[PDB]
């Protein structure tokens, strides 16, 4: 019937918006990802600089000697 079909087109509308979800959300997932991978490269930097402070300290002490 007619009113049934009107609001059934409404349900079709809700289906198409969820199709929009299906098209958008995972792209959001793998755009969050690489930000984090760069942050892991940043972990690598942090480890490097851990190594670096001690070197600086021993260098300055031997400079004093």
């Amino acid at each position, epitope marked *: 019937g007619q009113r049934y079909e009107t609001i059934h087109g409404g349900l079709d509308s809700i289906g198409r918006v969820m199709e929009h979800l299906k098209a958008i959300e995972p792209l959001i997932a793998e755009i969050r990802g690489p930000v984090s*991978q760069e942050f*892991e*490269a940043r972990r*690598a*930097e942090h*480890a*490097e600089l851990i190594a670096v402070r001690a070197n600086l300290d021993q260098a300055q002490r031997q400079i004093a000697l």
Partner: nanobody
Amino acid sequence: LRLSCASSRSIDGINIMRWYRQAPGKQRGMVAVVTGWGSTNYVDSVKGRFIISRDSAKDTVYLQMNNLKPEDTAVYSCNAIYRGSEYWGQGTQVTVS
């Protein structure tokens, strides 16, 4: 049928580096390996197929496509490892046939 990358600095002061293949709709995959030694190996799929070579001078590494069957069609990205870190570039793609 021949592809390369350049590092920021310190080629051969850069230890192990390798290349990776990204077939579409699939996840990451290693391709071939050069070392600081020039010691080299490939993955079984591309064994015999691809050839890799290092130029010590101009801060670079080389991959040359060979006798390719379209199945290898993918987007490739060249990788390197430095004092325990990842190093990834932007990569580039290869096509059918």
